[PDB]
Amino acid sequence: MVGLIWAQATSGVIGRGGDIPWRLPEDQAHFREITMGHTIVMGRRTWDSLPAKVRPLPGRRNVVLSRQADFMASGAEVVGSLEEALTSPETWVIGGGQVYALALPYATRCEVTEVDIGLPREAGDALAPVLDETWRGETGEWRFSRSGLRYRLYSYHRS
């Protein structure tokens, strides 16, 4: 099982300026629940976005994709291809835009948090992947984050 997990604005923006223009504790808790115990695969830029204090994310096999053969990610594995990272029963691809696109052919689940923020797309933004017809999606109810933004979860799935 390869899954993708991401949060996006309604416009599809998932990152900007190397970070994320919102922060929902409730979604972070859902992210921890879904990924705990499993492999997490992330691009190098997303690894760079994690403060050294918090990485590797605990209780998970942290894997970083990089084309730099000598890149060092203390507490993680750095691999040069996505296929190397797929040696567990569950692998969660946790970003960013480039790695979601690369991992989509391998995936059977996308856990997508939609953030009710009106965020027009900018040059340089990282964007969520386009999901074609093969994906089956249950659209959850709008929830109120304590941050003030509404959000809802889509659990997309395909065989």
Ligand X SMILES: Nc1nc(N)c(/C=C/C2CC2)c(-c2ccc(C(F)(F)F)cc2)n1
5 binds ligand X (CB under 6 A): yes
Give SS3 for 105: helix
Q: What six digits make up the tokens of 154?
A: 């889509």
- Taking CA atoms, 34 is separated from 10, 61, 118, in Å, by 22, 14, 26
Q: Where are the beta strands (DSSP E) in 74-130?
A: 77-79, 91-93, 109-115, 126-127
Identity of the residue numbered 36: M
Say which amino acid occupies 52: A
Residues of span 87-126 touching its own copies by CB under 8 A: 88-90
Characterize the bridge pairing of strands 39-43 and 13-15.
unpaired
One residue of 16, 21, 26, 49 binding ligand X per CB under 6 A: 49
User: Which residue, 41 or 127, is less far from Co ion as judged by CB?
Assistant: 41
CB of 159 to its own copies, least distance (A): 4
What b/e sequence results for 65-85 when a residue is b if at least 16 CB atoms lie within 10 Å of its CB, and e otherwise? bbeeeeeebeebebeeebeeb
Q: Of the two residues 2 and 7, which places its CB atom closer to ligand X in the complex?
A: 7
Q: Which of the stretches 27-35, 50-58, 62-70, 123-131 binds its own copies when contact is defined by CB under 8 A? A: 27-35
153 binding partner (options its own copies, ligand X, Co ion, none; Cβ < 5 to 8 Å by kind): its own copies
- Regarding 62 and contact with ligand X (CB under 6 A), the answer is no
Q: Closest Cα to residue 111, out of 62, 52, 38? A: 38
* Residues near its own copies (CB under 8 A): 1, 30, 32-34, 36-37, 88-90, 136, 138, 140-141, 153, 155, 157-159
* Residues near ligand X (CB under 6 A): 5-7, 20, 23, 27-28, 31, 42, 46, 49-50, 94-95, 113
* Residues near ligand NDP (CB under 6 A): 6-7, 14-16, 18-20, 43-46, 49, 65-68, 71, 80-81, 94-99, 102, 126
